[model samples]
Target: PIVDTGSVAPLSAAEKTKIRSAWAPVYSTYETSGVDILVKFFTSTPAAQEFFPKFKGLTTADQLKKSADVRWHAERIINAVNDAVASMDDTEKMSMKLRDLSGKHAKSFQVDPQYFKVLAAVIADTVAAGDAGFEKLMSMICILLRSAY
Candidate 1:
């Protein structure tokens, strides 16, 4: 199970609000943003792509956009992030989520835990990265995800 190391400062309500606002645009259009984030992540981190048997051969955005498998997986990935964000006020709930996800990805797929950081970076950059509150929340999430490894 993942344990919080107290590295992430507890989010004040205002900070949480800012983070949610920053994430709003992306989550609102998650149906499309999911694919966009996945494509970008795979593009920037090619070695991470082959984990998906279906996405391994897909190179272009156009190709990715047409694949139903990509869309389905994309929704899952985005929803995972959405879940993390929604559980910000509940640490135990959030850690349980990370543990659950990491066990599946890390154990089943032999996934390198470091890739979660890459995904987090991609999501941040694609969303509202560089914003203070967004970066803080991303750091908290990324750390928790990594801890589960």
Candidate 2:
């Protein structure tokens, strides 16, 4: 089920302006690719693996071998993507928070810049899924991530 953001509540002019000026650029860097990457990352994480009844592990690779409903997990991830979009806002603080969070996740699995690059591409592909904009979106996201590197 999708969460409702109360359609009657439009963003304030200040909030809208901030979003346009800030988050939009970050978001635009990924375009739909960000959305796609989000889908894959959340769906493939250890948390999703734990969502299953049969999977017995703390990692995605382990769960994949035993998961009986990968499609459902994907759907959950898509729903999560929608939820995140619905709550989008502009805040440099959030970006900083995310950067730190990414660092933590990176440490968890010894994630490297190259791995992040590959993960970013996988996300773009998930979003593009054969659309014409996919390649451009993928390239843009790669550059965005590389910039952080």
Candidate 3:
């Protein structure tokens, strides 16, 4: 079971609106953005690269960008993010889903909790860019995600 950490407050209508606006452009280019996210992750945390065998031998950013597996994983992550953003009003449901996701990653994949923070940073820097509110929202989501581990 996962506990709410109170790090992420329920988003206000205005905040939600802002989030949607900021995310819309990113989501439109989700595949490309997703690949960028993964590349950023691998670049910043090179040792973490061993976890994804699918990406083995694809060392360059361009190589990773061109891989089908990268595109597939990026789409999957974008879909999950879409779901999370869409369910902001029903946080309990969202939290439960995220908790389940976190548990699966930890137990089944042997993922390190710290990588979530790294991923979040990459995502925020890549997609949210200069929007402080969106960055904060992503940070809060990352905090909630970590609690599930």
Candidate 4:
């Protein structure tokens, strides 16, 4: 059962502007941003790395940073986030887009939503440049993907 925890909320206009502007730089260097986010995510919880076959048994930022598989998947994660940030104004669009990810991540990929929860803080701290708005934004997306999986 999904509970209404009220942790995620829609952003107001002023916040939307500030949040998007902050995201611009991160998206511009998404590769680096994603690598750092993924690395940090792994470091925070090694169990998160088990979902990815290529990342299995990998230790150290040095090896993870050098892995092609890491780079490839890292880009995918960042691009997914970029799209959501780009559509932040339309709550309908943003909510729908994030929900669309649920089936893919939850059912098809068999990943637990808890990992998305981990990324919530990691992505914010790493790519969102520690913006409070960005952290909240990721939490919104986190719960969206979190619900229907």
TM-score to true structure, per model: 0.88, 0.35, 0.86, 0.87
Residue 111, model 2: lDDT of 37
Model 1 deviation from native, Cα RMSD in Å: 3.4
Clashes of each: 0, 1, 0, 0
In what order do the candidates fall by lDDT, top score first? Answer: 1, 4, 3, 2
Report the lDDT tens digits of candidate 3 across residue range 67-117. Answer: 899889778877777788878788788878777777777778877776666
Write candidate 1's Cα lDDT for 1-149 as tens digits. 12224576677899888878878888898999999898788877877777878776788878998899999999999988899889988978987987777677767777776677678777887787566666667777767666656
lDDT of candidate 4 over 50-101, digit per residue (tens): 7887787788888999999999988998898888888886778887877888
Alpha carbon lDDT at 45, candidate 4: 90
Tell me the spans in candidate 2 whose CA falls farther than 4 Å from its real position. Answer: 1-94, 106-108, 130-149
What is the TM-score of candidate 4? 0.87
Give model 1's TM-score versus the native structure: 0.88
Which scores greater on lDDT, model 1 or model 2? 1
